[PDB]
Amino acid sequence: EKVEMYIKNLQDDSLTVRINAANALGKIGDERAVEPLIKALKDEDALVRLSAAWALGKIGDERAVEPLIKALKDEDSDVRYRAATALGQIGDERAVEPLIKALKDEDERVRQSAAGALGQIGDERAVEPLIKALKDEDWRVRQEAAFALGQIGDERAVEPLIKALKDEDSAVRWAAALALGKIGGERVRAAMEKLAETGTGFARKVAVNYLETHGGSAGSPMRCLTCLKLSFKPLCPNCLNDLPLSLKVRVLEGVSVYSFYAYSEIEELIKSKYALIGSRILPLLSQKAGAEFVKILQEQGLNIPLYGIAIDDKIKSFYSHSAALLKGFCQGNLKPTYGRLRANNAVSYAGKSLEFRANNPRNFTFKGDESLDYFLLDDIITTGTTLKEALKYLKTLNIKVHFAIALCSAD
Amino acid sequence: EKVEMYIKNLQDDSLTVRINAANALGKIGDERAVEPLIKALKDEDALVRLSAAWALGKIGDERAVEPLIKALKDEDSDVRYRAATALGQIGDERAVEPLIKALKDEDERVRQSAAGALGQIGDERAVEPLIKALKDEDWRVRQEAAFALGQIGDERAVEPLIKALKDEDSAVRWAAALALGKIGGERVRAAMEKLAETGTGFARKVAVNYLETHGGSAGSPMRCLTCLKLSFKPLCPNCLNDLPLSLKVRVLEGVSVYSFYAYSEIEELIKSKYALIGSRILPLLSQKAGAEFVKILQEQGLNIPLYGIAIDDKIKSFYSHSAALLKGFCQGNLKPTYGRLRANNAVSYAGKSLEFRANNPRNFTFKGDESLDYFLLDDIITTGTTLKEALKYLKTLNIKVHFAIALCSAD
Ligand SMILES: O=P(O)(O)OC[C@H]1O[C@H](OP(=O)(O)OP(=O)(O)O)[C@H](O)[C@@H]1O
Ligand SMILES: O=P(O)(O)OC[C@H]1O[C@H](OP(=O)(O)OP(=O)(O)O)[C@H](O)[C@@H]1O
Ligand SMILES: [Mg+2]
Ligand SMILES: [Mg+2]
Numbered sequence: 004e005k006v007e008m009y010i011k012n013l014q015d016d017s018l019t020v021r022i023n024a025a026n027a028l029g030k031i032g033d034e035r036a037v038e039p040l041i042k043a044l045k046d047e048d049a050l051v052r053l054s055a056a057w058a059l060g061k062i063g064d065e066r067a068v069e070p071l072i073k074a075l076k077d078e079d080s081d082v083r084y085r086a087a088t089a090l091g092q093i094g095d096e097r098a099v100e101p102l103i104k105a106l107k108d109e110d111e112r113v114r115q116s117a118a119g120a121l122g123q124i125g126d127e128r129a130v131e132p133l134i135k136a137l138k139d140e141d142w143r144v145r146q147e148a149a150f151a152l153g154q155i156g157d158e159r160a161v162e163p164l165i166k167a168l169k170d171e172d173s174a175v176r177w178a179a180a181l182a183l184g185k186i187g188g189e190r191v192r193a194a195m196e197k198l199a200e201t202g203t204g205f206a207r208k209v210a211v212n213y214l215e216t217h218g219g220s221a222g223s224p225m226r227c228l229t230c231l232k233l234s235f236k237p238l239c240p241n242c243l244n245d246l247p248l249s250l251k252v253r254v255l256e257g258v259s260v261y262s263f264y265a266y267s268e269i270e271e272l273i274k275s276k277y278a279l280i281g282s283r284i285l286p287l288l289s290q291k292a293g294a295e296f297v298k299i300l301q302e303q304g305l306n307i308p309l310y311g312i313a314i315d316d317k318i319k320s321f322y323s324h325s326a327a328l329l330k331g332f333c334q335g336n337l338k339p340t341y342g343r344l345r346a347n348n349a350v351s352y353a354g355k356s357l358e359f360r361a362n363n364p365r366n367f368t369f370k371g372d373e374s375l376d377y378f379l380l381d382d383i384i385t386t387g388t389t390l391k392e393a394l395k396y397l398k399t400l401n402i403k404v405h406f407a408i409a410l411c412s413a414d
Numbered sequence: 415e416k417v418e419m420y421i422k423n424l425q426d427d428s429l430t431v432r433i434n435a436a437n438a439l440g441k442i443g444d445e446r447a448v449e450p451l452i453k454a455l456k457d458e459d460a461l462v463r464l465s466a467a468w469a470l471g472k473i474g475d476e477r478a479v480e481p482l483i484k485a486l487k488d489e490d491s492d493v494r495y496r497a498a499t500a501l502g503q504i505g506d507e508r509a510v511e512p513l514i515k516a517l518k519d520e521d522e523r524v525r526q527s528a529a530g531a532l533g534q535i536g537d538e539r540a541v542e543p544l545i546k547a548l549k550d551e552d553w554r555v556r557q558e559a560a561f562a563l564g565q566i567g568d569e570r571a572v573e574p575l576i577k578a579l580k581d582e583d584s585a586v587r588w589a590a591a592l593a594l595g596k597i598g599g600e601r602v603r604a605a606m607e608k609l610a611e612t613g614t615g616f617a618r619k620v621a622v623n624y625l626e627t628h629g630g631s632a633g634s635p636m637r638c639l640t641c642l643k644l645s646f647k648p649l650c651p652n653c654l655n656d657l658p659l660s661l662k663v664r665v666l667e668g669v670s671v672y673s674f675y676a677y678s679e680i681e682e683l684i685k686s687k688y689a690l691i692g693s694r695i696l697p698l699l700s701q702k703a704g705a706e707f708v709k710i711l712q713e714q715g716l717n718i719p720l721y722g723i724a725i726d727d728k729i730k731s732f733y734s735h736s737a738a739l740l741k742g743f744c745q746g747n748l749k750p751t752y753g754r755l756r757a758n759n760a761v762s763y764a765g766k767s768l769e770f771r772a773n774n775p776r777n778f779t780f781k782g783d784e785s786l787d788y789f790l791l792d793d794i795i796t797t798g799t800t801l802k803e804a805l806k807y808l809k810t811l812n813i814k815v816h817f818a819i820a821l822c823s824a825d
């Protein structure tokens with residue numbers, strides 16, 4: 004590195020060489036450049052003074068705090084702006100009182116950068132002056148003071164920030180709503196409830212999102228089961244989107260079988276198929292799967308009306324589980340049919356060997372129109388025994404089965 | 415409707431007619447079918463008894479509560495299961511004590527359906543018996559008791575549910591973690607902190623998501639600026655994904671100009687370009703835009719290395735705003751270049767008429783290799799004055815400008 008070369012270039016006669024040396028020492032900043040840059044703050048030209056101030060904040064050494072405090076009283080508003088920004092970047096408590104005075108500066112950029120620096124330092128002494136800054140003539144200063152109050156997290160700012168939600172500027176209302184959510188509490192919850200209902204823009208977005216996780220509280224309010232956010236469906240769209248959809252194809256009895264999820268990735272959701280609460284989760288997964296499958300059929304060219312057959316469930320389930328899973332999957336040219344195929348025995352293959360499954364068949368029975376174009380759907384495929392049996396049985400009845408869907412794959 | 419026809423079919427001699435009448439009255443359920451269905455609960459066949467019980471819960475009339483309580487002591491476990499489910503669907507407090515006894519049933523399905531019904535009713539009296547049910551031999555009963563305790567929301571269940579996070583079944587741990595998050599509090603926050611760090615599966619997912627919004631609390635912890643969730647980037651991927659990306663194309667000086675967002679949809683994020691906190695939001699938006707644009711170039715066939723030129727920013731910004739916006743956009747065959755194009759005046763067109771803009775030009779200056787394949791990038795297009803001027807200037811210098819990018823559109 005050339006750190007020591009740039010340190011020498013700070014005392015050059017050429018202005019463009021002195022400036023480039025200060026900017027270079029801001030990127031490749033070493034503690035060796037701190038003392039030479041402190042001297043560069045007393046340069047004749049303001050372009051060198053502001054570049055040295057910028058570089059000192061980028062280095063972050065506590066030695067530059069006192070000369071940067073003197074640079075807050077500089078004749079040039081660009082040098083004052085850089086000194087205020089740098090003081091917050093360093094984060095030393097000594098800059099708090101000098102930065103509080105900079106909040107009353109003539110230049111709106113110096114006021115704004117001093118407010119942001121006070122939030123970066125996080126000292127409680129800045130709370131009252133930043134509350135006054137929420138009534139500045141420049142909206143950029145108001146916005147920066149609201150953001151700084153949220154970074155400090157002092158409750159003394161709650162009522163002034165609630166009044167800032169009625170500001171004329173959209174970015175100021177947004178900064179105030181954010182600051183409120185960062186502080187939290189009962190007065191904030193009540194302000195968010197009014198802002199979500201009557202507010203607009205990004206301020207309303209913050210309020211709506213805050214109430215999804217904090218508000219709406221009740222013993223039994225409908226919530227998402229993977230993130231606990233308030234949601235009418237047991238899986239919010241964000242959580243549903245995060246579920247890994249892995250498409251696989253196997254050929255069983257000449258019929259193509261499509262799976263959409265791996266058992267290892269949705270194990271708990273599958274295990275909860277006979278739970279009261281975790282029941283309505285599977286129709287959400289099959290709706291996601293059916294939407295991708297309908298695109299596959301269009302790419303294939305299979306645009307004929309198709310009729311779904313589900314393996315009829317027994318009294319061991321809370322509701323018509325297969326009917327709900329099939330109703331969710333069906334969309335586009337897919338249409339659901341109920342009670343066409345049923346097993347004469349209620350044996351469970353879960354956790355059983357391939358030998359047990361092959362020796363315990365479900366005696367299938369078909370009851371419906373045989374001239375229709377069908378497809379069968381089931382929740383999971385482990386060994387393919389159940390599907391091979393259903394396909395073989397319907398093939399003997401001369402029934403058109405275009406494909407089979409097994410939502411989840413364990414094979 | 416045929417409600418009164420099905421009411422008569424309940425007293426038919428044919429078994430298949432009596433069953434279909436009870437099932438039909440469960441879908442097209444009227445209060446007129448309640449008294450006939452109460453009589454159908456005392457049928458000789460269990461298939462009629464369970465269908466009448468199912469239909470009574472679907473109707474939800476309080477008159478069926480007492481005969482369904484008697485149906486909890488039925489000889490058939492399928493009729494008991496249906497009576498327990500229906501009692502929770504109605505939600506009458508009178509079923510609480512009879513359902514508490516059903517938690518000790520021989521059939522694991524009756525115990526499970528009674529636990530879920532107790533959670534639907536929401537009465538506090540079920541808390542202690544449901545806590546005992548968290549130690550059932552059947553994991554489906556344990557899972558249902560954990561879900562029911564979360565629906566009641568009584569704090570007496572916190573410590574037994576914290577012990578359920580160490581259950582041998584994955585769905586039971588998941589149900590217990592959900593129930594804890596639904597109750598909330600300091601003991602829950604501490605249990606979520608250990609579960610997020612040391613747990614696995616969906617139980618860990620719930621814990622991680624709960625801590626993103628409730629935990630990690632500090633005065634200045636890095637948070638998302640649209641949902642307040644803990645996030646190192648000022649916009650979490652979920653919030654970034656929700657931002658409406660609207661691609662538009664205009665031709666300025668023969669050069670195609672691409673925009674990716676509407677000003678009306680990201681107004682506050684654009685307005686905050688010169689704010690300290692809201693600064694790093696725009697490079698996130700241009701990274702999202704550049705990822706879609708790189709797919710457009712591949713579809714077009716423009717696979718040549720392209721070099722980005724940004725309109726150089728002045729001392730009015732916190733950092734190199736254009737450099738950060740260009741660095742975020744560039745990916746794939748797009749490579750960034752800095753300080754090649756600069757305006758000799760710092761006039762601001764924001765909120766000015768088309769007349770003001772056309773009479774106040776930015777005297778552009780190019781400094782770089784002219785033989786390169788370039789593209790220019792800017793944050794917003796309102797009237798196209800700035801872009802028409804930059805393109806016209808570079809065209810006179812015989813410089814290859816393949817296209818222009820204006821992240822945001824106000825035109
Ligand atoms: O590919 P396979 O080896 O045939 O296994 C798949 C079958 O296993 C499950 O049924 P199960 O018999 O366990 O019924 P259940 O719904 O009563 O648990 C599942 O619902 C499928 O029907
Ligand atoms: O399409 P147009 O009509 O030319 O307007 C677009 C220009 O307006 C803004 O610049 P501005 O002059 O406001 O600079 P600023 O960043 O200092 O506010 C923006 O950054 C573009 O340069
Ligand atoms: Mg099954
Ligand atoms: Mg559907």
Ligand SMILES: [Mg+2]
């Ligand atoms: Mg500009």
Ligand SMILES: [Mg+2]
Binds near residue numbers: 745
């Ligand atoms: Mg990038």
Ligand SMILES: [Zn+2]
Binds near residue numbers: 231
């Ligand atoms: Zn969710």
Ligand SMILES: [Zn+2]
Binds near residue numbers: 639641653654
């Ligand atoms: Zn977010």
